[PDB]
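Complex 972.
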Amino acid sequence: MENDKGQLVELYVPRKCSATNRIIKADDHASVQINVAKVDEEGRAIPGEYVTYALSGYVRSRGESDDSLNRLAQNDGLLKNVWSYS
Amino acid sequence: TRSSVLADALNAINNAEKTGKRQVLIRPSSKVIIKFLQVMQKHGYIGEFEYIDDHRSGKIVVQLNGRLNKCGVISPRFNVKIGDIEKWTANLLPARQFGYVILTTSAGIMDHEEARRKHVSGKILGFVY
Amino acid sequence: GDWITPENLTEAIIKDSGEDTTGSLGVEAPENQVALATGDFAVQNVALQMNLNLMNFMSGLKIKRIRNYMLRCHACFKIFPLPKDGKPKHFCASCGGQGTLLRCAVSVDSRTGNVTPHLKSNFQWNNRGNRYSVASPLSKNSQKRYGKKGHVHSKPQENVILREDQKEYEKVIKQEEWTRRHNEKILNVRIGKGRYVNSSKR
Amino acid sequence: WVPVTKLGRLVKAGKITTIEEIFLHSLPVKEFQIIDTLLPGLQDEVMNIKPVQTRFKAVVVVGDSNGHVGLGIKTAKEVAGAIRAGIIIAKLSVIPIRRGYWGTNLGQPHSLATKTTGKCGSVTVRLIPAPRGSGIVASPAVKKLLQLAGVEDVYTQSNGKTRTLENTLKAAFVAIGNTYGFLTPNLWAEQPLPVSPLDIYSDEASA
Amino acid sequence: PVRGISFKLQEEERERKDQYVPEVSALDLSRSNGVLNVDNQTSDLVKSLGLKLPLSVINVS
Amino acid sequence: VLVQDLLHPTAASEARKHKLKTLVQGPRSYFLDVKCPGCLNITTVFSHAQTAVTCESCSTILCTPTGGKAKLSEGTSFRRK
Amino acid sequence: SLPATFDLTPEDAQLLLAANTHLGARNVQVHQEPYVFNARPDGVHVINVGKTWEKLVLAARIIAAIPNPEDVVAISSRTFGQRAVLKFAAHTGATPIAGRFTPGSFTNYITRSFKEPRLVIVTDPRSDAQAIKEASYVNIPVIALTDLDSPSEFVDVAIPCNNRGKHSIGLIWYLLAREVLRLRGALVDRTQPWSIMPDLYFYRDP
RNA sequence: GGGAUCGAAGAUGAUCAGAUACCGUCGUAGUCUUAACCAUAAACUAUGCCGACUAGGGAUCGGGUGGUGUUUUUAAUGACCCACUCGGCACCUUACGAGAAAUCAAAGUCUUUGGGUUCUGGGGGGAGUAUGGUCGCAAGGCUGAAACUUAAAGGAAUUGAC
Ligand SMILES: [Zn+2]
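Predicted structure with zinc ion bound:
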């Protein structure tokens, strides 16, 4: 993906699922990307500031999507006590 | 009638990886299993792992990070001469420049590239990529 | 039992409506300027708590207190009048609970105007059939069973009734009325799965 | 043209300029004019026509010899009609291909990066990287698909009833698509996730 | 009215009909003697969250 | 489901598993101190005893075997040891 | 994290209890065994209303991120939900669909109903399954109100609540509208109650 | 030895009639049992045995543990109810998967091809024939060809003439 002179020779570098590290192919039309608004200290949403997650079609089809997103959001500040490790 | 404790362990890891789990438990352990996992860990295919004592051959819990495509065992443990190593890598690995074949030699357990630097051979165990 | 005879027939027919033909059934008890004699508990219920006068037409005495039956949902504890077909509705109109309406003994007083239920103190709950496997509409298995012919208008890929306002439910209630009228003049359905859903049927 | 879909409007307005954006965000494509403008060098080949009872079934491959290929099948009542509609379907299916080196990384990729397989019906097709100057070692029908994709050296093996022509092309098409699915150690690095263009230009795309 | 037909003398009424709101909310505890009737397990939930509410407890048993 | 702690199971979920399938094996039987109504002599009894244990002082019987736990006789008193 | 002013207030708690939103009924799926606090002896399960609040704010923060509001679609085929979604789409800028969904509304351009949503909000994932399925063909994320019996395929954010009672459905849509208007500048302060009564969202039969 | 019933064979009645077109009567061997033979069946789940993993729910049969539970009675036990667990005949849901498809908790963990081990097949006929051997009182069982001949025979699933 680099040639001998050190030049990049990929077309593009794919996105990877934040739940499972799988590559998201160019035709996985079931995959989605979620944007969560950042919140100002006066309690109002700031325009154009996001926390972002990506999920593969495999996870969504299997019904794990909601549980995975609770875990990710809770190790960021977005949730308090929804998810439990045990 | 467990004929191979090593074969069971790598089979459990494959099935967990395919379904997307982040951890797996394997029973029993052995010296050979520990050595095999340490090689996989060195090259970054797995996280940390932990051994549980029970006075009865113990258990292992392994953390999985999503990088592993396949691991597997070759049975029987065929004898391999230094000139033969090039044939096994052509058959088993998906490309010329990543993945490993794993050998037991009287110098220890190691991947096929270290065996070339040290110039040793022995018997085949398995593969990782 | 009791013999039905061609003289008694009209009274028996009224009894099968649920109306009290005997008078004083369940009776527990500006002057007398009006009184009402009636045998229907639904009318009696309204009369008592508005502080109307009810006449025991079998005996000539005013009624102060009576006991009868009404429905009570054991989920939300709300009370409902017993419908004239004499059995519970499938859904609670308040909380939407399914099958939670139980018939309950009730007393009414002119004095207080309040309504009091009477509860069996040693009630044992039955929980048979509350939980069972049910198909999902978006499973790969379901999409294969759905077939290639689109919507089949005969045997219509049946979907179970689980909500009060599900459009499938609207059909059955009106169609039930139609079949009733047709059959009665010419002579002139169940929902959920029941308690035993988890036992295999050959 | 007068684009009807939201993505078509951004393309005609010139806000999106390479097809790599569309692949990166995995967006659906509905209007063939989108491909027709982002990827003008595309050329087509007609693989088979046969009469059926009368109707005509046509199999069409399109690509440019530089990393993009597509496949399409159509039945129509006229020979010219089947080819015409066949090309439209093939343009909509375009997908990217990952290609690499058989050995040391001198001077531009020339082969596939890994072994890949695809299956359709009974037929299975397997592709293996090859050293430089081998050419494409494949049967004539599969050879043409790999040329339009822009592969130079590759070995192939196959199994099943390869004489059913369209199952063979579909199986090969699946195999080259899988090249971007395989994670390899140079892709282990971590990336920030881009913002979608349908966000940035939301007011250009509407109405 | 009939299906598939509409005219101003309906449209004007429908927009009036659906603006209806009662004078006192159906959720107001004033309708329920100032208390909430709940089971034992419900009052356990409240305590776990903290808070303090005018609950009334039925045994259910 | 996909992520869970296999090394620190909760005490409640551990208590309900079969004795061989907990993270580490162990018994769930125990021993008792037992006294007959007459004598002062305490004796130790295994909770799943198979024999009909007598007192030491005399041939009065303390327990009888069953398919599971042993049945202690009437009038005896016991303490879990 | 969001400041302490976002904690569940005692006044809102009374509303949730009065509407019976905590009654989860029976036939619990194996997913969503979280969100369950305990079971009664009669067999009804108590939903952890504290988690309902947490997830509802998270959903509001997702809706507030959308660049322009008509790109949000709210859907309810069932009749008890219809007035609620119509009111929701009036106070926010969202687009309502009430009644029959007509298949091929996110696929199949050259349809009178053709739309390109950025986000979909569904009132019942079993009855609205046609809308959920079609969203999965075109990379649209989904928010759903879910009871403990709801299937879970392709839903990304579940809000756990009683999904059957007329008041429960109306109250949840009401609270969402309040939260999005209050994350935007449309309501000036979180401390003062909103002037619109919940009853405006309730179903009205006769 | 026994011999009720039914009933290969056999002896007889009618030979007419297209739904009832194969029917009626008598009856030997047999059907049951004791002592020896025989070794076949669509002997079928048309699915070899041992071991690990990928999956969840409540019904039922056997055992065990807990409950301030109901009834028998003033305890124990018995019957019943709720929760949990080991083992079994099945069912419903689910598809990372598999397959030509019908379909499949194994028929999955296989071109990303290796857990241990036994048996069988190699286009359709000739043919389970001929010949040799071996077992059996016999009927027959087990093992088992070639010359020659032929372009198909076969599986699953679609649509629908007169
Ligand atoms: Zn109710």
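The CA atoms of residues 22 and 28 of chain E lie 12 Å apart.
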